[model samples]
Target: EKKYIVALDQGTTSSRAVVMDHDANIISVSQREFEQIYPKPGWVEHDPMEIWATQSSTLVEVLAKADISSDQIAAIGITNQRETTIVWEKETGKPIYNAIVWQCRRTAEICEHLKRDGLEDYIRSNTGLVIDPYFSGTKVKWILDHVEGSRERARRGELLFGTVDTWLIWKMTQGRVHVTDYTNASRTMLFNIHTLDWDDKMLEVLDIPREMLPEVRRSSEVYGQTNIGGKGGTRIPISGIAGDQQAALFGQLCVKEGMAKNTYGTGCFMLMNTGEKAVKSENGLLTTIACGPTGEVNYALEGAVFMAGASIQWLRDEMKLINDAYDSEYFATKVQNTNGVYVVPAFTGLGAPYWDPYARGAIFGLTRGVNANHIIRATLESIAYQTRDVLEAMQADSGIRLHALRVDGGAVANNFLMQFQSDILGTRVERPEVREVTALGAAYLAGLAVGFWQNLDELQEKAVIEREFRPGIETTERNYRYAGWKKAVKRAMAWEEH
Candidate 1:
């Protein structure tokens, strides 16, 4: 009588498949890291084909690992990196260009032009997002303009564009479904979050054809079924779809207005449920769509840190500071306070508050005393600092003060990071019993849609808190350290000439 739900967590750097039981327990999980393409100083790209291949492969792998059949999975849900855009041929299902990743800043000039043309207020009002290269609109425009013959082909209605979730769904159905949920659609900057539909006017502003876009739907629904099955069988119901952060929000059960959760994945994203009200942000926070348990639409305020756990990965792979990401905590605890070193991981530009695409990664206040451990400690500390930066902006804009932060994701395993996150923000941090709640959110959505589980109440009954972190630093020390962090970030900003 035990039915499972599969959550396809398509992230920025990897594709993960998590199989969860009726109790919301992870039964089996598989992850595969894909290559991250850095074509230019501030540009990032991913081959669309690789994304699909690895994701599909993991879908099979997870099932096989768990000895679960396709029919045993009541439904499959998808959660993915938002704002990463891929435009492909409708007939051939081939990408016209490499996927312009969310972290890429190649379209900074295009964003600048949009702002200079006085589209900021119009965009903010309609899309609930500021004009930035981090969004999909400019990246979509850049691809259409830069890729040879792409614009003409798009005009002929021969091309289609989608975020990673839509791409995966389309692939899973063997190119039958070209649909994206509201959570994914909201990040495009072409969709009017308030209107809950794609804005033809903004499409005209960005010079995007309406035909190339995907159909927008609610986050939780029976969108379609997979034609090609994994190791088990075919035509499994593809019921639920949500962008990664929104999925985490639902998984955390932050359903009420004023509830907030922070997910530390490739990027650190903080989203506060605003319920029916779409709060206008004065502090540069974004108004985005949150995943509703049912088919109804909801709104949330979001703050994104461009780097979080990705910084730890960088120290391991690039800098060779540590052998594994887990080693970061040990090396970090080896040093007390980074020896006054601040690592501003603005690697692919900054997100939220300061939307500076020209900003590159920089390390400040390095001295002879600062060693690898100091840098490692600084990298972990940067995650906490960036989060505090986001929290301040979020609270300022919405006027909804946060008493505590519900935390999830890979980096939450690091006790050092969790404690610092609480200390830096001077707020309590709650980590759920299941750290992999990103996948759980998708599981809940799919399970609900397919009659695998009745409703949110059933899932909430199973939710448990693993640990809580309270502020451990004095106000004086917190202020001094945070001031240093702010100074370091300013220097990192606009360090590169566009």
Candidate 2:
């Protein structure tokens, strides 16, 4: 007699499925991380089949774990890593190549080539996006051009292009539905956020075939139905879709303009809901789409910090400095400070304000006196520093002085990082009662679509604040440390060949 909504959160490093009931509480969740391919230096990829398999596996895994039948599910909602590109065959649904990851800089030359042609302003005017390889457009072109005969096949209507959202939906519907929401489409650099359609001129300029594009729909609606891996004809409405950060924004119920949420994942994604008006950024913040409760679309100012929690991962996975990421908090507090050490984790290049893809990771102020605790402390502080970099840029672009920021994701568990993040920004940082807000965001969107929840107010009631971190340090001390972070960043930027 129990009913639930399923949210499939397909992320950059993993696929997660979360099941929640009518009362907006988590019941069960499943997650699986897939392989990250590196064909060459600076090039990153993921096998599309692996992406589907992991996501589909988790979908089945969660329902079974919850002991809920497919029919018990009210609807299926999807939120995914935006801008990862995939083009697959129509009949077999086989991907032409690995999905070009959002972090990839392989398309840097391609983006630079476009800028050289003087199309940068035209792109900015229409797309409201920075001309960066982080977007899907050039990745789409990269696939069409490199993978032999991909373009001809695309032109002949034998191919289909979609971000992770469309790919998953197509698989869920058994290929009956080929679509994406405005939130995902807006990240492609092919769609005009203002017009809410695939830009014709932009498409022509990119030389991509328009026919391969999926229909752009709303973030919350019954896009199609799914038997969910052949559940013996028992159908469920696949009602909601959003690119992850937009879903988080909606999940946070930042429904009004001038509200923002920052999700600190492997990367940092900060978005400010600008409502209807697409406030073009004078700085590097991206102007993109956000979703409303009733299937209407709004605008947002977004910024990406290429590394956040990832720096912690490097310490565990690479440096072996910490036994676990959580140990970082323990060891970091052991030191009085970083002993003047600073880490600029421009691992795949700096994002926002300075969109330099050539920049790589670097550390500064290392001496014989510096110990492992200092390194650990500096690494933890790096996340806060990187976030401050974007928050400053976001303030300039939106003309909104942030009083507080809503934070989520795995790393928010670190009290030190959260407090540091607050101190650096000179504002309050809020962590929600539901740490899995990304999954909950997708779940809420789907719930809204099926009338499982009454309205935005109800969802807002569910978003409880577990903790609030107010700015701690004085202005002078914060400035002294932040100034060192800036200098370290300058040393890191363009350290590689441009």
Candidate 3:
């Protein structure tokens, strides 16, 4: 009988489940999207129940569609959107409030207070994170303080806290486990990367009780077992957990130092492996733990741009530029250039180098002659240009020059964007034959843990690239275009007077 590994990839916009054979090829897949709540401007929230229900439903659908029983599954692995916070009841297994999304700016004031109190350096040194609302710590604090009776319940040890990874594990295990892997824990702003434990001082500063936190574990160990729902009679070991981006980094086989992968999703996230040394960022890049399958931890420098493909979504839904998202590439390529128009997609505020939550999205250099084609072109070009900004800073902080980048996600299908990204960075961009690397990564981790695959070498052997985009434009032209983008970004944030 053949065995399979199940990977549950819970992302910002949707939850996906992919089943893969021992060879790392996808056998079956399922995805479901939930509602995105915006109570106020710059605030993002997800219903914790919806996250679990949709994910659970997708897992059942995928397994049945693949004609596989749960007993045939070797293990379960999870990769999720990092920094999304959830606090739930330990006894009742109910969420106390909605999950605060990573893109949320609801806790901007708390992040600001932490910075004003001069705790930014401490957080950076200890947690390899920046003082920003994009992390779980501030969001966790906000829930404890705002939710009725949550603070007291938390203090009494009745409440449990987790990022989405921990939340799913708890639900899958029927509240038997409260655990998170190193990669997910590293994003919470409370975990000390050096000591591999939650920082006491940081917890105190954030006013979160230590009892509320989950036990941190290795990314590829058996954290728990899945017993609830779907193919009921079987019990499968649940191993392998990492925040989505780090999982992608590992999935790409970027195990060596200076290796990198860029995931172009709703937001663009670029991560470069920095080996064992957790190189502290001098620029706005984040220092996060890159997890390996053997429980050995590596370090990475990450840069996140909050709006990537979502900018194109805005053009489709709001601006009514194109009827569907697939039409973006065609319309974008129709225009020879943006005609000097620049779009600074600060829609949910700038991330990475600029942690300004107050900043909003804006477009500069727009002219009366600029049609939807020009705007669409600018939007696509903006994704590549913003990536260049991140890569430049990543190079500065890591002291390692990038020769090439491995790309993945839904947006990589846009060949024009890939070419522009490579040209702007003056390097080669490789897109894998399997674009759904996020799910693939989780499947690999789970497969390895269950002894279905011998090692990373076997996984790498199965990985293949379908296309490669190399730099084509001259260096001078690339720099000239990037300079204009920088100016436009500066202007986008210069709306304080308004």
The most accurate candidate by lDDT is: 1
lDDT of each: 0.87, 0.87, 0.86
Q: Candidate 1 overall Cα lDDT vs. reference? A: 0.87
lDDT of 2: 0.87
Count backbone clashes in candidate 1.
0
Q: Encode model 2's per-residue lDDT on 388-469: one tens digit a residue.
A: 8778888898898888888988889888999988998788999888777887778888888888876877665687788999
lDDT of 1 by residue, 1-498 (tens): 338899999988999999988877889999998999998778899989999999999998998978888877888989999899999999899999899999898888889889889988888998899878899999999989888877778889899999999999998877888999988898899998887788888899889988899889877788898855545445688888888999988888877778889998898999998887788889988998886546357788999888988999999999988986359999899878889999999998898878888788999999977899999999999999999988998889778788888888889989999999899888899877877778888888888888888888877677677889999999998999999999999999888886
The TM-score measured for candidate 1 stands at 0.97
- Mark the 10 consecutive residues where model 2 has the least summed lDDT: 225-234
Q: Rank the candidates by TM-score, best first.
A: 1, 2, 3
Deviating ranges (above 4 Å) for candidate 3: 228-232, 494-498
- In model 2, how many backbone clashes occur? 0
| CA error at residue 6 for candidate 2, angstroms | 0.6
At residue 300, give the lDDT of candidate 1.
Answer: 89
Flag the better candidate by TM-score, 1 or 3. Answer: 1
